[PDB]
């Protein structure tokens, strides 16, 4: 019941996409912080970086 017009469903997927991006950034920052405490050094590596 209720439901929303197709124009509205475009405003929810965008919000959760932004939330997911922010959460990924936060996890990257946390790993970057933690790896510098357990050991003196860390290495940033990636497939295209």
């Amino acid at each position: 019941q209720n439901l929303a017009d197709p124009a509205y469903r475009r405003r929810r997927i965008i919000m959760q996409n932004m939330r997911d991006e922010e959460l990924a950034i936060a996890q990257v920052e946390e790993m970057q912080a933690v790896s510098a405490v357990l050991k003196g050094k860390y290495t940033m590596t990636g497939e295209a970086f």
Partner: protein
């Protein structure tokens, strides 16, 4: 850099590619670096 923002954290944006399926993207970019001033203030031990 056109807007005037530099050395910030989590700069967001979006654009439309006007392609055959359309599409509207979303992006965040930060360039983070977490550093420690005094490295041997901690002591790490494994506890095998």
């Amino acid at each position: 850099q056109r807007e005037g923002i530099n050395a910030s954290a989590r700069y967001p944006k979006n654009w439309v590619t006007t392609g055959d399926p359309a599409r509207e993207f979303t992006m965040i970019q930060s360039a983070p670096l977490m550093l420690l001033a005094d490295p041997d203030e901690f002591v790490s031990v494994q506890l095998a």
